[PDB]
Amino acid sequence: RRAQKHRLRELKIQVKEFADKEEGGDVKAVCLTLFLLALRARNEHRQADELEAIMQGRGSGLQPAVCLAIRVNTFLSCSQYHKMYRTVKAITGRQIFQPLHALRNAEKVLLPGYHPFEWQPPLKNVSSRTDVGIIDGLSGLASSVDEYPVDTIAKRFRYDSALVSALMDMEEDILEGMRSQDLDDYLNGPFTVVVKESCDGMGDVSEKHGSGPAVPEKAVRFSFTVMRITIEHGSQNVKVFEEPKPNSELCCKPLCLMLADESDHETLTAILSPLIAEREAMKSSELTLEMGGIPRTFKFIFRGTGYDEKLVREVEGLEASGSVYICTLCDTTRLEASQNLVFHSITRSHAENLQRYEVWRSNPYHESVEELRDRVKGVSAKPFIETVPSIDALHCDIGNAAEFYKIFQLEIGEVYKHPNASKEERKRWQATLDKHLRKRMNLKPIMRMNGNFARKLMTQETVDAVCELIPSEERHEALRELMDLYLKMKPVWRSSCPAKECPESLCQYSFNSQRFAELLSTKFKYRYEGKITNYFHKTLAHVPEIIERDGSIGAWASEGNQSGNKLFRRFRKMNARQSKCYEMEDVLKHHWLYTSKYLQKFMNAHNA
């Protein structure tokens, strides 16, 4: 120390006189920037920035919300997180990560059943407590030897508590939205919320704990998504909030989840009757909720759309999907769908379904089954949930792509010239197309047609390739034009806002679908003479009106739920207690956390 003092006293006097005369004696910041730049010269930006921090003075460690965000968006256990914690604490000497109890305390705030709220008028048949979080989904379903045996583990939030937690989770975002829209932070207008409803029965959620592949077990997750928030400023509705990625992995808030077949209709209704009761209660009330000081009045609109065709038909009281009444929006027969391709309207609501079921059960006009079923257009069950007339988009494009794949297998075999082959040339045609496409495009075929397969297969290049396998001269163009029109049509519904992403496709969609219909009806009559699949009715005849009624079609879809399935399995093996009672509320709590937003804007801090 004395050594370096001697060694450098010359530079000492030099720099001190020069810096004192130059900047006025502020040698501190002068020498600071001096060593900063000198150390940056040798590319030590790491040390330079940490020294900038140490002199600035800031944030040696993290606060509990961030540690919670990390172990939730990284899927750490508690033993593993604690291991990392104590390691860093012993090496650094500081305390960057926070102990487990700090994270439990920072978690109690982001789960539902923490904030105060007030319904006015109160919710019929719903309690008034505000601290109800995870509760048994069976809703006290009587389980003795004398009752209809139920064995399905099922956990749920109370619906109002879930919405309250979601709203005071996106409080900051909607405040920023009012700022951006040139409104007052302290404005308490009746915020109309628009929520999406989605229930999807994921299957095979089991794992082999020991020896024996015996039992497959299924699951159902009923969930929602705050889709937009809109205040009625003066005499106009301004969009304070809109979801960026509507059908995304990590905005579909989980609400209820159960281990039961999606078609175990008694169990499904036993579990979802309370939830429907709650969402029917909170349709004539207004949530009063203090948000950033001032209290706000929210008012809800529910829209049930994340339902695949199967559940739509199941919980609306419609015949199974392979019936004669095909469209769940218009009451029309398959034959009449093929005769009249695109002129239909949308004429099947939920109240209409209830009233037709009443006609069925009552049978007021005393007529046999085969004309009563014409009277009631295939409604022979009591509608259970109120869904909306809409088409899914994921299953729509998958179904249409599978139908084009079938058309390809047929065109290879020239089914038009020599019809009614046998069930060996069929498989021959299939293997032919498979080998050919795998050779030409590395497009290895598979059985369960996923979305990547449908994405790759539906390209002008694929038809330009498969066109080299038909002895015909005109089937070439009769597939080229067909794929051309299908692609001119795909964005119209696949877009999350076709008004301001492709309005030319939107204003041509009618003409394109009508030409597509003509083309199927003339150069493909050997297939679409009778049967026309459901999706080639929805896609063709109802999109240009579902648009004018809802805006997009891609936003109101089941993709957001279909993805979350991943998470479930992961949680169920990495974050759970095997207790078969706690082992499900753990999954449900962690999935609620993962889906939060006050944490996604921490795990997205690197961008901003």
Partner 1 sequence: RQHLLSLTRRAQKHRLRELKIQVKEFADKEEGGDVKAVCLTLFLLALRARNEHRQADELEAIMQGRGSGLQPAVCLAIRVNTFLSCSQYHKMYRTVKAITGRQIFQPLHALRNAEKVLLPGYHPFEWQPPLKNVSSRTDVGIIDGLSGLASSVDEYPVDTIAKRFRYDSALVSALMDMEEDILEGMRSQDLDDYLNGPFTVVVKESCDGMGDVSEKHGSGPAVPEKAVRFSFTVMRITIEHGSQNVKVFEEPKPNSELCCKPLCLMLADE
Per CB under 8 A, the segment of 35-43, 137-145, 295-303, 412-420 that binds partner 1 is 35-43
Tell me the closest approach of the beta carbon of residue 229 to partner 1, in angstroms: 27
Cα four-point dihedral sign 529, 531, 536, 538 = positive
Give whichever of 174 and 205 is closer to partner 1, judged by the CB atom.
205
CB 594 within 8 A of CB 250: yes
C-alpha torsion 543→546→550→556, nearest 10: -60
For partner 1, which is the closer residue by CB, 42 or 500? 42
Whole-number CA gyration radius for the chain = 31
The distance in angstroms from the start CA to the end CA of the chain is 44
Neighbour-count burial of 599, counting CB atoms closer than 10 A to its CB (0-12 exposed, 13-18 middle, 19+ buried):
buried
Q: Give the one entry of Ca ion, partner 1, Zn ion, none that residue 330 binds, where binding means its C-beta sits below a cut-off of 5 to 8 angstroms depending on kind.
A: Zn ion
- Which member of 72, 93, 123, 188 binds partner 1 (CB under 8 A)? 93
Judged by CB under 8 A, which of 78, 92, 186, 581 binds partner 1? 92
Instruction: Show Cβ contacts of residue 400 under 8 Å, excluding neighbours closer than 6 positions.
Output: 458, 486, 535, 536, 539
Number of residues that bind Zn ion (CB under 5 A): 5
Other beta carbons within 10 Å of 274: 21
20, 87, 116, 122: residue in contact with partner 1 (rule CB under 8 A): 87
Spatial separation of the C-alpha atoms in residues 590 and 126, rounded to whole Å: 26
Binding mask 283-322 for Zn ion (x = CB under 5 A): ----------------------------------------
Q: Among 154, 231, 330, 492, indicate the residue that binds Zn ion (CB under 5 A).
A: 330
Q: Which residue has the tokens 């975002």?
A: 173
Q: What separation in angstroms does the CA of 465 have from each of 97, 452, 462, 474, 545?
A: 57, 19, 5, 15, 35
Nearest approach in angstroms of CB 593 to partner 1 is 15
CA distance 559 to 565: 10
Assess 327 for contact with Zn ion (CB under 5 A): yes
CB of 344 to Zn ion, least distance (A): 5
Residue 78 partner contact from Zn ion, partner 1, Ca ion, none using kind-dependent CB cut-offs of 5 to 8 Å: none
Residue 18 interacts with partner 1 (CB under 8 A)?
yes
517 forms part of the interface with Zn ion (CB under 5 A):
no
How many residues interact with partner 1 (rule CB under 8 A)?
66
**Closer by beta carbon to partner 1, 84 or else 421:** 84
The structure tokens listed for 157 are: 């939030």
Least Å distance, CB 214 to partner 1, is: 9
**Using the rule CB under 5 A, is 308 a contact of Ca ion?**
yes
Among 182, 207, 468, 474, binds partner 1 (CB under 8 A): 207
72 in Cβ contact with 602 (< 8 Å): no
8-state DSSP, 554? S
Residue 378 has a CB neighbour count (10 Å cut-off) of 22
Applying the rule CB under 5 A, the residues between 525 and 544 that interact with Zn ion are 537
Pick the closer one to Ca ion by CB: 443 or 587.
Answer: 587
Each residue 256-295 as x (binds Ca ion by CB under 5 A) or -, in order, gives ----------------------------------------
What 334-341 contacts at long range (C-beta under 8 Å, 24+ apart), as own/partner pairs, is: 334/530, 334/531, 334/532, 335/530, 337/532, 337/537, 338/528, 338/529, 338/530, 338/531, 338/532, 341/514, 341/517, 341/520, 341/521, 341/532, 341/540, 341/541
Q: Residue written as tokens 């309690």?
A: 127
Residue 462's contacts (CB-CB under 8 Å, 6 or more residues apart) are 437, 441, 443, 456, 483
| Distance between CA atoms of residues 407 and 506, nearest Å | 26
Q: Is 559 in the site for Ca ion (CB under 5 A)?
A: no
The reply to whether 200 sits near Ca ion by the rule CB under 5 A is yes
Burial 148-161 (b: 16+ CB within 10 A, else e): eebebbbbbbbbbb
**Residues of this chain, 419-478, that bind partner 1 according to CB under 8 A:** 448
Q: Which does 93 bind (CB under 5 to 8 A by kind): Zn ion, Ca ion, partner 1, none?
A: partner 1
Question: Mapping DSSP to helix (H, G, I), strand (E, B) and coil, where does residue 364 land?
Answer: coil
Q: Which is nearer to Zn ion, 278 or 309 (CB)?
A: 309
Please report how close the Cβ of residue 559 comes to Zn ion at its closest, in angstroms.
22
Question: Could you say which residues in the range 254-293 bind partner 1, by CB under 8 A?
Answer: none
Residues that bind partner 1 (CB under 8 A): 4, 8, 10-12, 14-15, 18-19, 22-23, 26-35, 37-39, 41-42, 46-47, 49-51, 53-55, 58-62, 66, 69-70, 73-76, 80, 83-84, 87-88, 91-94, 96, 204, 207-208, 211, 213, 448, 602-603, 605-606
The residues binding Ca ion (CB under 5 A) are: 200, 308, 562
Residues that bind Zn ion (CB under 5 A): 327, 329-330, 344, 537
